[PDB]
Amino acid sequence: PNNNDEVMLLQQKLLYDEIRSELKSLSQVPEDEILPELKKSLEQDKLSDKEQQLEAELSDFFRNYALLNKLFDSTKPYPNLIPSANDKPYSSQELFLRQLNHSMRTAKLGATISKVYYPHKDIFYPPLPENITVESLMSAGVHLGQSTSLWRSSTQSYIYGEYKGIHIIDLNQTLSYLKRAAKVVEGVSESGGIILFLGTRQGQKRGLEEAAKKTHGYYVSTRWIPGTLTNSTEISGIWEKQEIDSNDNPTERALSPNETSKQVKPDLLVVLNPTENRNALLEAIKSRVPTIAIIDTDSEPSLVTYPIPGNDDSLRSVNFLLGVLARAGQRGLQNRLARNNE
């Protein structure tokens, strides 16, 4: 119906390529071949009233947009695609875009998929704490504790039993502890506190980064520097701070050097692997920072304010519990930004 519109452009585009190709052909020809013959023609020609019109219209048109102009100043998708000729076969890039078109429309015809676990959805579509069931926790593997040989008997009250040489964590208690921990994250988020998510086991970064992003919090996936909280001026003083309003938007006010050296202590610390982060837990205790952590059967519950009994070795179990806490924080943040609007 409107294809001709695009055809009109392509016509010019083809013509432009022709003009450019033969501009380069004349750039090779020696001047001795063209110049003297060209000048001789003018020596044998007489300008007419019309010819003179362009003698000065082009002089100004070239003395306005080529010489007396500002060289600088003080199709949206894939705009650099070089389409192939209508007779030539598709280019590699065009085949990729032709396949992308198929992927959006046709590639998903025939059936829909239900009741299938997709790992990424644990991070991007975590459930709300009130909708979590024992089945959901069990599906994520949260009940699978450590070997009975590695039992830290201080966890006895969290254990449901032993099965296949491991201790089974009581998910009924996990759910109650998880709900309590989730409410704490929501409260701190709704109050404007700094929430730090600490996890240093391989693969946890993706979950940790999204959790911080949706709660406007912070995360550490690589290494907890011993002294980050107790020796904060020697480790974190150099890094930049900022002032923000009740909507979490940067105020842009420059900060006095006094305000930029003061310790910035987290209001809440979430630890995915506490057995490998004793340093962080002890600093949190020394600094009076409440902490949440996943407590496996070989982990010490009393080292944290709000333990969550659960498997800490599986990325699915960790990302499931982290996702729930992250969404709880998000709801607190959304309730704080809503009360500011109204």
Partner 1 sequence: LPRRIVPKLATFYSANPNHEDRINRLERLLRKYIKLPSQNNNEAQQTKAPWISFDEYALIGGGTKLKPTQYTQLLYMLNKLHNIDPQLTNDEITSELSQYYKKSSMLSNNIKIKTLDEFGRSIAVGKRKSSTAKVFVVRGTGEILVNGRQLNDYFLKMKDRESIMYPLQVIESVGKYNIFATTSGGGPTGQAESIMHAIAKALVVFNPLLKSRLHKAGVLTRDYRHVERKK
Partner 2 sequence: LKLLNMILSMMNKTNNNNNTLDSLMNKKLLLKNMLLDMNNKKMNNMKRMLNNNNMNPAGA
Partner 3 sequence: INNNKYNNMINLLNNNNNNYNNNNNNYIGNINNIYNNMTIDNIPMDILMYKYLVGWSIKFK
Binding site for partner 1 (CB under 8 A): 77-82, 92-93, 96-97, 100, 192, 194, 196, 209, 212-213, 217-223, 225, 228, 236, 239-246, 251, 255, 259, 262, 264, 266, 340
User: How many chain residues interact with partner 2 (CB under 8 A)?
Assistant: 30
Stretch that binds partner 2, among 41-49, 94-102, 221-229, 235-243 (CB under 8 A): 41-49
Give the whole-angstrom CA distance, residue 105 versus residue 88.
Answer: 26
Give kind and range of the element (H or E) at residue 306. strand 306-309
Site for partner 2 in 225-254 (CB under 8 A): none
- Residue keyed to tokens 């966890």: 155
Q: Is 69 helix (H, G, I), strand (E, B) or coil?
A: coil
Provide DSSP, 53-102.
HHHHHHHHHHHHSSSSS-SS----SSTT--PPPSSSPPPHHHHHHHHHHH
Q: Do strands 144-147 and 306-309 pair parallel, antiparallel, or not at all (unpaired)?
A: unpaired
Q: How far is the CB of 254 from partner 3 (least distance, A)?
A: 21
Both tokens of 80, joined, read 């650099």
Going from the C-alpha of 94 to that of each of 79, 81, 88, the distances in angstroms are: 12, 8, 12
Of 7, 19, 26, 68, the one binding partner 3 by CB under 8 A: 68
Q: How far is the CB of 279 from partner 1 (least distance, A)?
A: 13
Residue 313 in contact with Mg ion, rule: CB under 5 A? yes
Dihedrals phi, psi of 72, to nearest 5 degrees = -150, 180
Give the whole-angstrom CA distance, residue 141 versus residue 319.
Answer: 11
Residue 212's binding partner, choosing from Mg ion, partner 1, partner 3, none, with beta-carbon cut-off 5 to 8 A by kind? partner 1
Q: Are 235 and 225 in contact (CB under 8 A)?
A: yes
Stretch that binds partner 2, among 40-48, 116-124, 137-145, 227-235 (CB under 8 A): 40-48
Of 23, 104, 113, 338, the one binding partner 2 by CB under 8 A: 23
Give the whole-angstrom CA distance, residue 227 versus residue 342.
Answer: 42
Residue number closest to Mg ion, CB atom: 296
Of 122, 170, 186, 312, the one binding Mg ion by CB under 5 A: 312
Nearer to partner 3, 13 or 39 (CB): 39
Both tokens of 330, joined, read 């998000």
**Residue 280 forms beta bridges with which residues?**
none
Q: Are 218 and 274 in contact (CB under 8 A)?
A: no
Both tokens of 27, joined, read 């750039």
Residue 72 in contact with partner 3, rule: CB under 8 A? yes
Site for Mg ion in 267-306 (CB under 5 A): 296
Residue 20's binding partner, choosing from partner 1, partner 2, Mg ion, none, with beta-carbon cut-off 5 to 8 A by kind? partner 2
In single-letter form, the type of residue at position 57 comes to E
How many residues are given for the chain? Answer: 342
Footprint on this chain of Mg ion (rule: CB under 5 A): 296, 312-313
Footprint on this chain of partner 2 (rule: CB under 8 A): 11-12, 15-16, 18-20, 22-23, 25-26, 34, 38-39, 41-42, 45, 47, 51, 54-55, 58-59, 61-62, 65-67, 69, 71
Footprint on this chain of partner 3 (rule: CB under 8 A): 67-68, 70-72, 74
